[PDB]
Amino acid sequence: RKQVSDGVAHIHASFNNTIVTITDRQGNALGWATAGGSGFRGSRKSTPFAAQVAAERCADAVKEYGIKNLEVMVKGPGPGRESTIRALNAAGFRITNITDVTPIPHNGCRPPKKRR
Amino acid sequence: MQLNITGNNVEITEALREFVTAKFAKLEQYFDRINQVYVVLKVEKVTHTSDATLHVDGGELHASAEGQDMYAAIDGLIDKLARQLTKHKDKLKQH
Amino acid sequence: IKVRENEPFDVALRRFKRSCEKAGVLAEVRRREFYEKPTTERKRAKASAVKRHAKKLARENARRT
Amino acid sequence: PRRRVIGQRKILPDPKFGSELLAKFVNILMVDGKKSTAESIVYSALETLAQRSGKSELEAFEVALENVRPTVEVKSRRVGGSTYQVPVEVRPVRRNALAMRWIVEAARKRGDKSMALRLANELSDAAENKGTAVKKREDVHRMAEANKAFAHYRW
RNA sequence: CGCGGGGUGGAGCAGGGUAGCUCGUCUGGCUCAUAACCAGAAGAUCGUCGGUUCAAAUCCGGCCCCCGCAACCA
RNA sequence: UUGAGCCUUGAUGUGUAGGAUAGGUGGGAGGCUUUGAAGUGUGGACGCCAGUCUGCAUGGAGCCGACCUUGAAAUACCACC
RNA sequence: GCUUGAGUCUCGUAGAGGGGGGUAGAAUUCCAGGUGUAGCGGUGAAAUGCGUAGAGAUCUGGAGGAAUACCGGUGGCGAAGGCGGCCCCCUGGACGAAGACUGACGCUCAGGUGCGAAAGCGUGGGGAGCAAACAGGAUUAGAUACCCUGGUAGUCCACGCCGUAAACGAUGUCGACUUGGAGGUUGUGCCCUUGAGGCGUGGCUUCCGGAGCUAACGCGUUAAGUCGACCGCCUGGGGAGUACGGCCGCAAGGUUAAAACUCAAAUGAAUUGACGGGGGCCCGCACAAGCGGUGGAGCAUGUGGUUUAAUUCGAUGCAACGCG
């Protein structure tokens, strides 16, 4: 329960799927929703509209916590990543920060081969 | 697949008719499903020439081959049609 | 990268900062070490960059219109 | 076509009512170019609409048409090596013409005895929204709203 | 040879006041077709009988099938 | 920290009909109240989002049962659960 | 003898030049814990795979390996191969300014000697990610491949071996000479450093072009121009950089290097076409948007085929088949 007020809304933004989860300031999660679980499967999982439906399905089931302000973390080069945040300020939230936290290696491990 | 064998100055025998259909059974399954075939055999004082008009789900394709003794002409005709059938097949796959 | 701007919400002011160097980098770490093609592509790049310098300087003679 | 935004020509209106919208409607079911046979069926089908609905005749026709006209239409779009059904919003001059074509193709099936009453039954049932003409509109919207994932426009 | 558990669309199964979902099978759309996905519909007297109250897939009896645990030292 | 069991209690059990979130059965028109009433400062639970409980009042001396519909009449009151 | 070639020294300057040791942050993976719940992952679509034994997402902590984002530059350095975080230690060369010094000490080399990407090999470690082989899922007529999910050698370290690459600038080394332009990088001189100013002068380097050269493409002061010194190499295509022999190597193999036979060509550059599942632009009932047909029915007619004594002959993809 705990009725927390300010939270963090992480957005995983892979190419094939967009995952949006909502946590608090401390970092432990509250609820999540994906674009593959919103009824979109296959070619339509990589659509910015499917990231919007994943957002409003995650904007519900956190009414139990009562969030009115949250930060936004985006991670990945996805087709969503900005249509998700438009489905949150329209859902009645105060977006204090929007932050890019995508992982960039300062040249570390070897990626796979280019597919032909 | 329906064969229609026809000869201009080459009256087709029974051994030649089954030689066409056994050869046209090859370029069958192995390359594409087809609707209807018209085969035309011609002899023009030197050239045993064999034509063929295939009808497929997309359009039509035609090939001709002149040869040596009317058996190598159809053997060159199928290799001309089989390459046009693989080019047409991958034109309709585009994966 | 980090926008904590006030007033009216419109990332608009976010994609100015973020579409700067946050997607060209992740799409090129996406796959293949290359180890020698960077070289090829790099060297093809500037042979076409001076193709824009040494032609557009020579294109200011006339325009036939 | 490639060129030629076509110079559009006009239609002469209906004699009995001052409308070209119903004159467009009589031209659709006019089979083999027989207009007197076409106009006799539609006049016998809308006087039947008045007694079976209570209202006046011509405005009972479009209230069966706003219940059957669509707002979005889905198309096949060729992109990449495949082709998916992208939805697009309909222009209004096509919107009514797509509606009254759906009425006639439902009127040639749904086989009752005469053509005048075959049209007269579902022009009522378009207003009560249980006929098979409205089930064409709702199953078009069922496919367009399922394909809301394809579009660079948000309206 | 008694204690338990389960009998529900073709199957797998959800579910004291109304029978649901995936597949398969019936189509629509699309595809070059099979497909894949999308969109609707049929699919049950809930194993069979009785009664327990207004009303039972639900609760209680007996029967049939099945899975278990034993009693298995004539 | 935590199951499970017992006791002391305190809540809760909207099909339909319908004035109503009525658990069952039985006794059943007397209790409630100024041990400072409805409205609400208020705070929650439940939430089958419709209604009930409790904390404190600045109000202050009121409310139901039989009489309306229901297979059933009222946590009106009490008892067994 | 001489100082102009070559070299030494004195001051500096730039540099991913090399070898050794330390260390930092980002990220991947794994492990542990918290929260949290039905999906994740993947693809053109899909499945294998993962997940109700709690994945994925998210947060904290830890372990370990490899690689150094941005800077990063037709930038720099090195004989070539090659060399990128940062710090220290040892160390090689290049270059410039002003002198001083030795006095042809030079150039190039068959053999020889050393260095030499990646893969591979041996012994001993290490092993995150990636990934031959291999395994499964797809695609397909088939798919032993491309794609997907996994995944072992290998990639990493130390010490040896191998001695090969389209090891390329497909251009040996050295020296001299012969119109220019735009730069990059790095020293330095003078004048008003009086201002990121102006004039010069070196080194390396990139591009474009003149003469000339070249079969043409192109090269063009860093030549493929004009010359000189020496070395390597070539002699039609296949056979064949193969056989045999020698040498070298643990092995893989390297190196040296034929002949029989066979062909009248092989080849280079450019030209015009044609074609491209290359690019741009445009048109046509070509598609789309619609209407009505065919294919299914009986019949009319033409053809193929069969039949017949003859079923006259010709027309055969589009452009023959209600055609002569």
Swiss-Prot record, chain A:
The lineage of its organism: Bacteria, Pseudomonadati, Pseudomonadota, Gammaproteobacteria, Enterobacterales. This is Small ribosomal subunit protein uS11. It comes from Escherichia coli (strain K12). Located on the platform of the 30S subunit, it bridges several disparate RNA helices of the 16S rRNA. Forms part of the Shine-Dalgarno cleft in the 70S ribosome. GO terms for biological process: cytoplasmic translation; translation. One of its GO terms (cellular component) is cytosolic small ribosomal subunit. Has been predicted to contact the N-terminal domain of IF-3 based on footprint studies; exactly how IF-3 interacts with the 30S subunit is controversial. Part of the 30S ribosomal subunit. Interacts with proteins uS7 and bS18. Cross-links to IF-3. In stalled ribosomes contacts ribosome rescue factor SmrB. Keywords: Methylation, Ribonucleoprotein, Ribosomal protein, RNA-binding, rRNA-binding. One of its GO terms (molecular function) is structural constituent of ribosome. Belongs to the universal ribosomal protein uS11 family.
Curated annotation (Swiss-Prot), chain B:
The keyword Transmembrane does not apply. Keywords: Translation regulation. One of its GO terms (molecular function) is ribosome binding. CDD domains: RaiA. Disruption phenotype: Non-essential gene, no formation of inactive 100S ribosomes. Double hpf-yfiA deletion mutants form 90S ribosomes. A quadruple yfiA-hpf-rmf-sra knockout strain is significantly outcompeted by wild-type after 4 days growth. No change in sensitivity to aminoglycoside antiobiotic gentamicin in stationary phase cultures. The keyword Transferase does not apply. GO terms for biological process: dormancy process; negative regulation of translation; negative regulation of translational elongation. InterPro entries: HPF/YfiA_ribosome-assoc, RHF-like, RHF/RaiA. Induction: Induced during stationary growth phase (at protein level). Induced by the signal autoinducer AI-2. Pfam families: Ribosomal_S30AE. GO terms for cellular component: cytosol; cytosolic small ribosomal subunit. NCBIfam families: PRK10470.1 (NF007780), yfiA (TIGR00741). Associates exclusively with 100S ribosomes, which are dimers of 70S ribosomes. Belongs to the HPF/YfiA ribosome-associated protein family. Short HPF subfamily. This is Ribosome hibernation promoting factor. It comes from Escherichia coli (strain K12). The gene is hpf.
From Swiss-Prot, chain C:
The keyword Protein biosynthesis does not apply. InterPro entries: Ribosomal_bS21 (IPR001911), Ribosomal_bS21_CS (IPR018278), Ribosomal_bS21_sf (IPR038380). GO terms for biological process: cytoplasmic translation; ribosomal small subunit assembly. It holds the Pfam family Ribosomal_S21. Residues 40-65 are annotated as: Disordered. One of its GO terms (molecular function) is rRNA binding. Gene3D superfamilies: Ribosomal protein S8. One of its GO terms (cellular component) is cytosol. It comes from the Bacteria. Residues 57-65 have a biased composition (Basic and acidic residues). The keyword RNA-binding applies. Signal peptide: none annotated. Keywords: Ribonucleoprotein, Ribosomal protein, RNA-binding, rRNA-binding. Residues 43-56 have a biased composition (Basic residues). NCBIfam families: S21p (TIGR00030). Part of the 30S ribosomal subunit. In stalled ribosomes contacts ribosome rescue factor SmrB. Belongs to the bacterial ribosomal protein bS21 family. PANTHER family: MITOCHONDRIAL 28S RIBOSOMAL PROTEIN S21, SMALL RIBOSOMAL SUBUNIT PROTEIN BS21. Probbly involved in recognition of ribosome rescue factor SmrB in stalled/collided disomes; fusion of protein fragments to its N-terminus decreases ribosome rescue in the presence of SmrB. This is Small ribosomal subunit protein bS21.
Swiss-Prot record, chain D:
Keywords: Ribonucleoprotein, Ribosomal protein, RNA-binding, rRNA-binding, tRNA-binding. It comes from Escherichia coli (strain K12). Disulfide bonds: none annotated. The gene is rpsG. InterPro entries: Ribosomal_uS7, Ribosomal_uS7_bac/org-type, Ribosomal_uS7_CS, Ribosomal_uS7_dom, Ribosomal_uS7_dom_sf. The keyword Nucleotidyltransferase does not apply. SUPFAM superfamilies: Ribosomal protein S7. HAMAP family: Ribosomal_uS7_B. The keyword Acetylation does not apply. This is Small ribosomal subunit protein uS7. One of the primary rRNA binding proteins, it binds directly to 16S rRNA where it nucleates assembly of the head domain of the 30S subunit. Is located at the subunit interface close to the decoding center, where it has been shown to contact mRNA. Has been shown to contact tRNA in both the P and E sites; it probably blocks exit of the E site tRNA. Protein S7 is also a translational repressor protein; it regulates the expression of the str operon members to different degrees by binding to its mRNA.
